[PDB]
Design a protein around this ligand. Sequence first.
Ligand SMILES: Cc1cc2nc3c(=O)[nH]c(=O)nc-3n(C[C@H](O)[C@H](O)[C@H](O)COP(=O)(O)OP(=O)(O)OC[C@H]3O[C@@H](n4cnc5c(N)ncnc54)[C@H](O)[C@@H]3O)c2cc1C
Ligand SMILES: N=C(N)NCCCC(=N)C(=O)O
Length: 381
Amino acid sequence: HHHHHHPIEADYLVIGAGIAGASTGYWLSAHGRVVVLEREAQPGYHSTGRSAAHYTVAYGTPQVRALTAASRAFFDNPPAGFCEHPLLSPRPEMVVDFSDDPEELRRQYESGKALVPQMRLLDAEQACSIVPVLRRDKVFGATYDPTGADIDTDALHQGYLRGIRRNQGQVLCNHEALEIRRVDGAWEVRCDAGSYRAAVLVNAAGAWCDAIAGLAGVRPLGLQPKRRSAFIFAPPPGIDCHDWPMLVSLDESFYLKPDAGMLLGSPANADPVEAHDVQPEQLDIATGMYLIEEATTLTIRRPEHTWAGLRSFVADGDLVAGYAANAEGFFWVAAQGGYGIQTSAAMGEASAALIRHQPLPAHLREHGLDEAMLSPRRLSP
Ligand SMILES: Cc1cc2nc3c(=O)[nH]c(=O)nc-3n(C[C@H](O)[C@H](O)[C@H](O)COP(=O)(O)OP(=O)(O)OC[C@H]3O[C@@H](n4cnc5c(N)ncnc54)[C@H](O)[C@@H]3O)c2cc1C
Ligand SMILES: N=C(N)NCCCC(=N)C(=O)O
């Protein structure tokens, strides 16, 4: 009974315009008609705008580390015209043992060194020389990754979206997918003003990927969104922190990193929650501030900014890029966890290749990636 536009035909409908949908759509867009359907009025309102992203490697898991390592080539040397300014800024990471767990510290050093030969093992004095506000009594040693970097997430994100548009793709905000149905050989998505059809449905909906499967009648993966809060605060007068590394506790109880001339802190939490527009909890912010004030001489005045975002995982902690078993044309780009920005170039290129029934590109295979490692089929016996 209500008017709708005539349906729009495409080759791939991408649900979600965050880093997952943008990166996959970027690499698809040279090959066919891409339409990205995004619920919000902007593409980076959810997790992709909430990360203050950092890059490493040295450290998630074999699959995560391989996706991250394979992404660096694009970040450091993206195609001409992709963006105006460098995407990465140097920002070593120092993981400090505040627990007195030398065996764990040595484990993480040996493991990181295997992918990052410049990985170093520091004693407590060396850690305190690098971040001089550390309390020496609280520090037992550290690892140091000289190769870490900060990511200009908004430039990267906007570069992917711009590339889609330059290849005649569409990025449509205020286009929540409300219904999804397999109709005459295509996936057909109803948005509030009209419908969209394509042989391939690319589910890149962040914390909402299982909700999208629910609209489509496709068995979900068991994705678990987890809240992480962060805040920005001023350093004390006389503390010149702008060149400090990313500092993380060995047991991931907190982290602290410069963000320009301010400091970013976080309790590095992972509280399981439903997919929603998540807000910071006061106990998260108070805990992060408490732990920083205990580990360092800093005292924290009232934050300038607080927020939280969702880091969404499947059971094994690995990302998912692959067609659903038994659901023709439904492709998952999911379970980015805490790693969606730093893995986005390899995930985007790999997912687009697999959607198109193509082998993974050599340079990805050389970093120890294969289709099986990415597939949702591994979550089932
Ligand atoms: C505090 C914090 C720190 C982090 N640090 C880092 C870091 O250092 N490095 C790193 O790589 N990552 C980091 N992350 C993780 C990173 O934020 C996520 O992995 C990444 O942003 C996930 O991207 P996404 O595209 O899957 O999700 P999102 O950006 O949330 O995008 C999903 C999109 O789908 C849309 N959508 C949902 N349902 C529908 C629907 N029905 N119709 C249409 N659109 C829909 C949403 O509106 C949203 O825009 C951090 C995250 C947090 C919160
Ligand atoms: N880099 C580490 N070794 N751990 C710090 C995690 C930072 C991060 N990607 C996040 O908050 O999701």
